[PDB]
From a paper:
These studies identify Cachd1 as a conserved Wnt receptor-interacting protein that regulates lateralized neuronal identity in the zebrafish brain. Biochemical and structural analyses demonstrated that Cachd1 can bind simultaneously to Lrp6 and Frizzled family Wnt co-receptors. Wnt ligands use FZDs and LRP5/6 receptors to initiate Wnt signaling.
There are three ternary complexes in an asymmetric unit (ASU). However, the CACHD1 structure reveals an addition to the C-terminal region of the ECD that does not show any homology to known structures in PDB by Dali search. The two α helices of the N-terminal dCache domain (C-1) interact with the LRP6P3 propeller. Thus, CACHD1 serves as a cross-linking component in the ternary complex, independently binding to FZD5CRD and LRP6P3E3P4E4. Structural superpositions show that the CACHD1 binding site on FZD5CRD overlaps with the “thumb” and palmitoleic acid (PAM) lipid binding site required for the receptor-ligand interaction with Wnt.
Numbering used by the authors:
A (entry chain C): 630 to 1004, 1013 to 1246
B (entry chain A): 53 to 344, 349 to 869, 872 to 1088
C (entry chain B): 32 to 135
Write the structure that this text describes.
């Protein structure tokens, strides 16, 4: 049961012994470029650190085994990090994104705690036995804030300080210690921001700070050393090591620094996801980002309706909620060049086209179960038949409308021609039609056809130049498309009649659009905007979000109605067909086949030759 | 009519001035009886003892920038999340007024810096209000000698520690300075800047083109190449050099000045621009130049978009046609930058497209084959008006070059501090965050600090040092001026010139290629620079050995070397002796003591009660800390208690070796001088009396206060006595340091013994200074023939071995020439006649690199015996007799002008210029004059085979003007208050130090009929209304 | 009978024959050359092209063997020499002899 001192310096997490104060060894870790915030766990003797050059937070034991990245997306530059050894949680403060967030110890169930009016949080300290989390801010007005470990009751604890760092709690004396970089001193205070006392002065830049027994340790970048002193008086001043320049964070490694208890206990407080400590040693059950707490106030629920907007190397998700919750990045690996997106509301899998790999890949929302559906070929846009469970995707290299199952089993080609150039495509299985843009030169067309390639007809051909995106909404019975050359967004009924222009101003490069309730969202790559127009016409064009580079596609997802889906005839056993099952207007259900096959005499299976 | 007998008597006058009045015969016996130690060294041991010194000076200096690197390296990995979010400034702060250390400016330096605002300042996230002060103050306190510390961010805020006010008259843009351009992009740029005047470019539109063309040249470095071209019906480059019309010349200080005056000298023409021929010549220049080590090549074009009448896109065809053929012939290495000169709309939107296609080299638009299989370097295009910042737009062309992520320290050559002080040497290294650039850090140090161990080398009397680099540029050599005195030095000087000597180019090979080594060579005595002749230790030699030992300065691109003349002959230095001071030691700082009955001796604080002693900057363990830091009364007492310390209890307060030993060996002059003063009859003729040593000791009587930076080892009387061992050396007339005006000096060397009387065995010289008219008062009293008439047609005169007259009937004149005291201006006919006597007059051309000039001077044969009379000229109208004064370097001569004769020697009365700086003739008479340069700024050699043994060894020695102060000038009288107007005849006023014999009235040439003696303040040079020589 | 010019300064100037004594009481071309060569720096600096022609017309005057008449030259050679060279002569130690004033 020995206490050491862990500190970070460049790419090294170096360890100093406090008894035989001579052992200087480094923690056996590889791949670290720059180490920053430090904290550990008393249960399994893990060491946790933040890497602000790789934008990751990684974890491992004291031997380098089980080296893993628990937080790897959505980080800018976080040097605030602390461990909840009781509730088995992780908190961190990111300065670039201005967010104090939360997740489990393995990196799952990511939730944002503080995202409003937060100006660069840094040093983070935790008091889980009492239910408080303390952190520092610089920026405009440097101050030290207080809040519960769930994001509520945020208060300004110490208003008049300089740029502070190295926030450490002495859990025995009920006091809070911190350094000050502008007034050049180290000072203390009780657990509620007052009774402030300066311990030592004339430190031109005390960056790090920690506490153990009657001794506080700090590092000053001017003196290039780690020092020890009496925690309350400042006497008995000794040097631990010299020639150590620019330590990013120091930490006392001992089991008494992480004692106490709370009501989360060993059963996670019987919460489904997160156990977040609140006053009176109590707890509340937290939920990941965009999840809501149910009525029982112990279980969480995923969002039933939400929107997905993608970038070149990142897929995002935002909800319209009255909490005004922020959007998050979906932890999907190997995202390279996403061109278009679509979502399956049944098995909760997100699909996309990576134009640098020429692949159609799928994965869960949390990143697991990554699978390549299609892998020369050059996909461009996709639209999912969520009923029959099969995908329509257009290939720009062969200029065909090709059909592929969700598992990757090829079905066949339903549309091909010498002059045809199918690009954007959206399906409407509720009525048995598919819509697609036909980008023939100097004669662009918007056509439609049945789900097998026959019954082809041209809907609109005039008034078009570069129809680059397509979408529809079966409830409203409307077809929407954006023109990046004429700079306008238009509308029309699902039969070709009632063609109107919804907006033709302040449009530059609309590469995507979708319908969410009575709102038409679209994305502008050049203007870097997500905006919306009310279809009812009572409200005006409203800005949603700015500062989003490399926009590609957007897709809204409504909750899947259990009764409406199963009452579709092709939903069960694909309607008994071997390939294509399409709804016909006369109320009956008919099987069909691609263009290189013929429907056999049983009117269920297909044949060749 | 005799002349030899008059020379024996006038020579006994010289010995009485040296033996009795100065004490040479006594001090030669005192140093003859002292015991010395001996060394025989080939330079192998001394080279690594001195390489041991400066290598640790560079290691501590590299450990500052490697520190300040890991400072800023950690100052982004932390400040990507711990930024400033604050604002400060570099002015509006009225304390300071300290001028401490090298920072001779207002400087608080209470661990606080400042932030100089650029124009491209926004929000972003960088240096935390320079919270770096935490470490910056530690750096300044823990490493004395360093000067400035600064950080120029990529954003543009210029932050420097410590804080001072340095040109708040505009904006201090550092990203467009030569410091920050050659550091982030250390590769050599081959730039040509093409200017567009003509096609009726307006004057405000031309004013932007000439201001921006002068921001580019003020931002590059000499390892680059530049050639600016003008284009208007014809292409004419700078018409000020030969290789400007052929090659690209490096961008030194001399090329920047010529190329910028060729700017603003061009005014708007009217013919069509003629674009295509302007680019075809810029490639013909880049082609002819060498590649020489990593090179990028760029062309900048400053136009407004010019068309003709029916050749608007046809001449556009011809421009992008030669861009494909010429740049394709160069493997597409050239990059093209274009800047538009728009104002009010004179340049439309279509002429912007013509300057777009030039930067991108968009040749396929105008139908060109473009058979260049290799891609083209895509250039940029920027717009300008009279409101744009020309430092952040045109000055930032270097961001368009490939950044190869070079992370190596770059060492700069000395340059003037842009912050309001003298000379600086700066090393800088870029700063990377993975692949994101941050800016650079830089540590400024005084040039005198880096070189203090090689500029003040006083170990052996047989050796001297010099510092070089890889390609041979001399950073220091005894032929250069001390770094502390300079204003802007010409570093562009190879050692093949300073150490020019036959068979030196063979040793120059092994020094630049081998890390270390040693080597001896044999050189004849004649055809050798003086530094080797002043250190010979065998009498009567025809050739001599020299040993060179060199070694690289580790972890940098510099090389040190030790020169030892005659390594086999033992060199002696004074053994440690401990004589008790018979007369107590008085340090020369009389302003800090004030205890003696003080008085004023010319422009000096002095005393007549006891002589003083001086320690030059070279005597201390740290010469820079003695020159920059003030010297307090406490420092004088530690030095006085240690120099006269007969015991060995007082520790060394900061002196070198052999410093206290040469003070205890020369303390015997205090008894000689005080005894002679009271029994001498020349108390009113001698202005002072002094002795000097090579290790920096200077004893003077009357003991006077001198400037701290005064070095007697660099004066002419000292350098002239060592060249003539044992002989009495007459030096002058020369301007005295103590403000005594023009004086004449008798100097003589004293040796370790007497069995060995060579130049190298000189351990000290003695000197005694007289007045200008004294030696003409001696000729009239000693030699009766001179008084036959009043110095009109029968004139007597004394000449030194350089041609100057220390005694002459006429004194001072149309207030000119400058070299008026030379024989060529006062006696023209003798000069033409003595140039014809063979083996007696030698004209010398030495090369002085200090002020980039070549000096002319005469050297008379000091070993002549017998008379010299008229041989060809002056056979009728002007008889002459010239002979040598025995045992000295002076000559006595008489002229008998019996009939008028007209003779001329060209001597400038406005400058010093020679008439003809093309050739030099032996028989062409002209007073000592100069010629600028005989080199070429193209290859770096001598135009003619001017491998003369040169090195005039500065010998210019920039005369200062250190006065005293008002209010104290009138509170004291003259020391020797020799009341002037109580002297009656000319024989009693000539030679008195603060008097002068007034012969001319206050109006030119009016002989006043009552010549009286007066304080010299009244009548200067004889005219009672004449103005000051100063 | 005239003798040919022997001073190297005044050879190949337009005429070959001169006769001593001249205007400055020089008895031989040897003695006349010793003074005129004191102007040799001015001739090689090329201030006025008329300088060698003007100076040599003074020290080594034209001699015709059986002519012996005083046919005059032309003052224009005197005032072109002093036009371009006098500002440079006064700059250094040179000064015109009074026997060479452009009025004679
Ligand atoms: C990359 C590749 O070959 N993919 C094949 C494709 O060629 C073929 O059309 C399809 C069914 O025939 O199966 C898949
Ligand atoms: C700290 O200072 C107090 C002064 O009141 C002293 O009593 C105590 O022993 C000190 N602690 C240590 C560890 O020296
Ligand atoms: C909701 O939370 C409260 C805590 O204030 C708890 O008492 C209550 O039981 C929860 N709701 C239900 C339905 O249990
Ligand atoms: C359509 O499907 C496969 C993938 O399932 C695709 O690779 C191929 O190019 C197409 N094949 C046919 C027969 O159309
Ligand atoms: C002195 O210089 C002359 C110059 O020609 C040379 O011939 C002679 O050898 C030199 N004397 C030596 C080398 O002893
Ligand atoms: C050069 O040195 C050698 C010994 O190394 C010596 O014998 C010779 O006399 C010297 N030559 C000189 C001094 O000219
Ligand atoms: C010049 O001096 C040298 C040696 O110093 C001597 O040999 C020579 O004879 C001297 N010439 C005359 C003309 O005195
Ligand atoms: C020297 O000058 C004197 C007077 O000026 C004169 O009497 C004497 O004849 C001269 N000597 C000559 C001409 O040899
Ligand atoms: C000039 O001298 C250098 C040696 O410093 C030499 O390399 C170069 O060739 C010379 N230039 C010529 C000979 O044109």
């Amino acid at each position: 049961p020995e206490a050491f001192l862990l500190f970070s310096r460049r790419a090294d997490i170096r360890r100093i012994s406090l008894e035989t104060n001579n052992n200087n060894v480094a923690i056996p870790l590889t791949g670290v470029k720059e180490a920053s915030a430090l904290d550990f766990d008393v249960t399994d003797n893990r060491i946790y650190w933040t890497d602000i050059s790789l934008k990751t937070i990684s974890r491992a034991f004291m031997n380098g085994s089980a080296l893993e990245h628990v937080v790897e997306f959505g980080l800018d530059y976080p040097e605030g990090m602390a461990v909840d050894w009781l509730g088995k949680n992780l908190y961190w403060a990111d300065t670039g994104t201005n967010r104090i967030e939360v997740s489990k110890l393995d990196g799952q169930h990511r939730q944002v705690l503080v995202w409003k009016d937060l100006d660069s949080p840094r040093a983070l300290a935790l008091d889980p036995a009492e239910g408080f989390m303390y952190w520092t801010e610089w920026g405009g007005k440097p101050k030290i804030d207080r809040a519960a470990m769930d994001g509520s009751e945020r208060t300004t604890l110490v208003p008049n300080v300089g740029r502070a760092n190295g926030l450490t709690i002495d859990y025995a004396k009920r006091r809070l210690y911190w350094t000050d970089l502008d007034t050049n001193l180290i000072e203390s205070s009780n657990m509620l921001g007052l009774n402030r006392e300066v311990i030592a002065d004339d430190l031109p830049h005390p960056f790090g700070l920690t506490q153990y027994q009657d001794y506080i340790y700090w590092t000053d970048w001017s003196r290039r050393s780690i020092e020890r002193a009496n925690k309350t008086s400042g006497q008995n001043r000794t040097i631990i090591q010299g020639h150590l320049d620019y330590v990013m964070d120091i930490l006392v490694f001992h089991s008494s620094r992480q004692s106490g208890w709370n009501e989360c206990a060993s059963s996670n407080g019987h919460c489904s996801h997160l156990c977040l400590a609140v006053p009176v040693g109590g707890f509340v059950c937290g939920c990941p980002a965009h999840y809501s707490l149910n009525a029982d106030n112990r279980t969480c629920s995923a969002p039933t309706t939400f929107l997905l907007f993608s970038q070149k190397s990142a897929i995002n998700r935002m909800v319209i909620d009255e909490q005004q919750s922020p959007d998050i990045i979906l932890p999907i690996h190997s995202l390279r060049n996403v061109r278009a997106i679509d979502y399956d509301p049944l098995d909760k899998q997100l699909y996309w086209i990576d134009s640098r790999q020429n692949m159609i890949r799928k994965a869960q929302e949390d990143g697991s179960q990554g699978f390549t559906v299609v892998v020369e070929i050059q996909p461009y846009d996709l639209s999912i038949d969520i009923y029959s469970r099969y995908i329509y995707w257009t290939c720009e290299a062969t200029n065909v409308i090709n059909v592929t199952r969700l598992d990757g089993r090829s079905v066949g080609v339903v549309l091909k021609g010498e002059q045809d150039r199918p690009r954007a495509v959206v399906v409407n299985p509720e009525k048995g039609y598919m819509y697609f843009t036909n980008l023939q030169e100097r004669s662009p067309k918007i056509e439609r056809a049945a789900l097998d390639g026959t019954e082809r007809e041209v809907l609109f051909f005039s008034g078009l130049s570069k129809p680059i995106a397509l979408a529809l909404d079966s409830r409203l019975g409307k077809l929407f498309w954006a023109d990046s050359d004429l700079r306008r967004i238009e509308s029309s009924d699902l039969s070709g009649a009632n063609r109107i222009v919804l907006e033709d101003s302040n449009i530059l490069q609309p590469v995507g659009l979708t319908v969410f309730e009575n709102w038409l969202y679209w994305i502008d790559k050049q203007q870097q905007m997500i905006e919306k127009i009310d279809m009812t016409g009572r409200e005006g064009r409203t800005k949603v979000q700015a500062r989003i580079a490399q926009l590609s596609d957007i897709h809204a997802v409504k909750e899947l109605n259990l009764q409406e889906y199963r009452q579709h005839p092709c939903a069960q056993d694909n309607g008994g067909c071997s390939h294509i099952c399409l709804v016909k207007g006369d109320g009956t259900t008919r099987c069909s086949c691609p263009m290189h096959l013929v429907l056999l005499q049983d009117e269920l299976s297909c044949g060749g030759t | 009519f005799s002349i030899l007998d008059e020379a024996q008597v006038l020579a006994s006058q010289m010995r009485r001035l040296a033996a009795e009045e100065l004490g040479v015969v006594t001090m030669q016996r005192i140093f003859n009886s002292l015991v010395y130690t001996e060394k025989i060294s080939n330079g192998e041991s001394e080279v690594q003892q001195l390489a041991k010194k400066i290598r640790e000076k560079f290691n501590r200096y590299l450990d500052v920038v490697n520190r300040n690197k890991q400072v800023v390296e950690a100052s982004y990995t932390a400040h990507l999340t711990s930024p400033l979010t604050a604002i400060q400034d570099c002015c509006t702060i009225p304390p300071s007024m300290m001028e401490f250390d090298g920072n001779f400016n207002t400087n608080v330096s209470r661990t606080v810096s400042c932030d100089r605002l650029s124009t491209t300042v926004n929000s972003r996230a960088f240096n935390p209000g320079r919270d770096l002060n935490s470490v910056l103050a530690d750096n300044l306190k823990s490493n004395p000698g360093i000067k400035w510390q600064y950080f120029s961010s990529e954003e543009g805020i210029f932050t420097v520690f410590p804080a001072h006010k340095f040109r708040c008259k505009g904006s201090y843009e550092h990203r467009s300075r030569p410091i920050y351009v050659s550091t982030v992009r250390p590769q050599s740029k081959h730039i040509v800047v093409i200017l567009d005047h003509g096609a009726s470019v307006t004057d405000t539109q031309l004013q932007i083109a000439k201001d921006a063309a002068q921001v580019i040249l003020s931002a590059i470095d000499e390892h680059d190449k530049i050639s600016v071209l003008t284009v208007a019906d014809a292409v004419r480059t700078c018409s000020l050099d030969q290789c400007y019309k052929t090659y690209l010349s490096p961008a030194t200080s001399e090329t920047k000045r010529k190329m910028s005056t060729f700017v603003s000298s061009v005014k708007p023409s009217d013919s069509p621009t003629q674009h295509a021929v302007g680019f075809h010549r810029a490639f013909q220049l880049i082609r002819s130049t060498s590649n020489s080590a990593n090179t990028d090549m760029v062309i900048i074009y400053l136009s407004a978009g010019i068309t003709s009448k029916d050749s608007s896109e046809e001449d556009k065809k011809a421009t992008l046609r030669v861009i494909n053929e010429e740049n394709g012939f160069l493997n597409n290495s050239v990059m093209i930058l274009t800047y538009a000169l728009m104002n009010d709309g004179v340049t439309g939107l279509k002429e912007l497209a013509f300057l777009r296609d030039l930067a991108e080299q968009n040749s396929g638009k105008y139908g060109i084959p473009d058979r260049t299989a290799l891609p083209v370097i895509k250039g940029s295009m920027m717009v300008l008006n009279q409101l744009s910042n020309l430092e952040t737009t045109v000055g930032r062309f270097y961001t368009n070059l490939p950044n190869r992520m070079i992370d190596e320290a770059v060492f700069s050559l000395p340059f003037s501090d842009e912050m309001g002080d003298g000379l600086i040497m700066t090393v800088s290294k870029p700063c990377y965050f993975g692949n994101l650039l941050l800016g650079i850090v830089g540590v400024d140090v005084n040039l005198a600090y880096i070189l203090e161990d090689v500029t003040y080398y006083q170990d052996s009397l047989a050796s001297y040092t010099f510092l070089i680099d890889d390609k041979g540029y001399t950073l220091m050599h005894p032929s250069l001026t001390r770094p502390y005195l300079l204003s802007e030095p010409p570093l562009h000087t190879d050692i093949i010139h300073y150490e020019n000597i036959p068979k030196f180019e063979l040793v120059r090979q092994n020094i630049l290629s081998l890390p270390l080594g040693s080597q001896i060579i044999t050189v004849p005595v004649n055809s050798s620079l003086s530094w080797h002749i002043n250190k010979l230790r065998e009498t009567g030699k025809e050739a001599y050995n020299v040993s060179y030992a060199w070694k690289m300065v580790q972890d940098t691109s510099f090389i040190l070397c030790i020169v030892v003349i005659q390594p086999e002959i033992p060199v002696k230095q004074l053994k440690n002796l401990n004589t008790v001071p018979s007369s107590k030691l008085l340090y020369h700082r009389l302003d800090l003591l004030g205890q003696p009955s003080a008085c004023l001796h010319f422009k000096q604080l002095a005393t007549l009660e006891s002589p003083t002693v001086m320690l030059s900057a070279g005597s201390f363990s740290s010469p820079y800390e003695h020159l920059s830091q003030p010297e307090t009364k406490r420092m004088v007492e530690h030095y006085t208690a240690y120099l006269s310390d007969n015991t060995r209890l007082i520790a060394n307060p900061g002196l070198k070796f052999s410093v206290r030993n040469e003070v205890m060996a020369t303390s015997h002059v205090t008894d000689e001088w005080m005894t002679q003063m009271e029994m001498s009859s020349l108390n009113t003729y001698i202005v002072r009396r002094y002795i000097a040593t090579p290790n920096g000791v200077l004893r003077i009587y009357p003991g006077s206060l001198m400037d701290k930076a005064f070095d007697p080892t660099r004066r002419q009387w000292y350098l002239h006595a060592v060249a003539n061992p044992g002989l009495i050396s007459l030096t002058g007339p020369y301007l005295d340091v103590g403000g005594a005006g023009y004086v004449v000096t008798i100097s003589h060397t004293i040796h370790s013994s007497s069995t060995q009387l060579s130049s190298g065995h000189t351990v000290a010289v003695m000197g005694i200074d007289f007045t200008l008219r004294y030696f003409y008062k001696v000729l009239m009293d000693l030699l009766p023939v001179c008084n036959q008439d009043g110095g009109n047609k029968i004139r007597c005169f004394i000449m030194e071995d350089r041609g100057y007259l220390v005694a002459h009937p006429t004194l001072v004149d149309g207030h000119a020439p400058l070299e008026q005291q030379h024989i060529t201006h006062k006696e023209p006919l003798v000069a033409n006649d003595i140039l014809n006597h063979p083996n007696f007059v030698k004209k010398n051309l030495c090369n002085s690199f200090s002020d980039r000039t070549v000096q002319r001077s005469y050297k008379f044969n000091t070993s002549l015996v017998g008379d010299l009379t008229n041989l060809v000229h002056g056979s009728h109208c002007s008889k002459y007799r010239l002979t040598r004064i025995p045992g000295t370097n002076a000559f006595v001569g008489i002229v008998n002008e019996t009939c008028d004769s007209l003779a001329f020697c060209a001597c400038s009365m406005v400058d010093r210029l020679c008439l003809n700086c093309h050739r030099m003739e032996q028989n062409e008479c002209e007073c000592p004059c100069e010629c600028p340069l005989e080199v070429n700024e193209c290859t770096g050699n001598l135009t003619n085979a001017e491998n003369r043994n040169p090195s005039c060894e500065v010998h210019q020695e920039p005369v200062t003007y250190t006065a005293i102060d008002p209010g104290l000038q009138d509170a004291l009288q003259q020391c020797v208050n020799s009341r002037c107007n109580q002297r009656m005849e000319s024989g009693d006023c000539f030679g008195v130090l603060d008097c002068e014999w007034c012969v001319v009235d206050s109006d030119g040439k009016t002989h006043l009929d009552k010549s009286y003696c007066a304080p010299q303040k009244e009548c200067f040079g004889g005219i009672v209304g004449a103005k000051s020589p100063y | 009978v005239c003798q040919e010019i022997t001073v190297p300064m005044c050879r190949g100037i337009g005429y070959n024959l001169t006769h001593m004594p001249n205007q400055f009481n020089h008895d031989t071309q040897d003695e006349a050359g010793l003074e005129v060569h004191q102007f040799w720096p001015l001739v090689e600096i090329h201030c006025s092209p008329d300088l060698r022609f003007f100076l040599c017309s003074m020290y080594t005057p034209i001699c015709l063997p059986d002519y012996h008449k005083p046919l005059p030259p032309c003052r224009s050679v005197c005032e072109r020499a002093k036009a371009g060279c006098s500002p440079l002569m006064r700059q250094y130690g040179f000064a015109w002899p009074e026997r060479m004033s452009c009025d004679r």
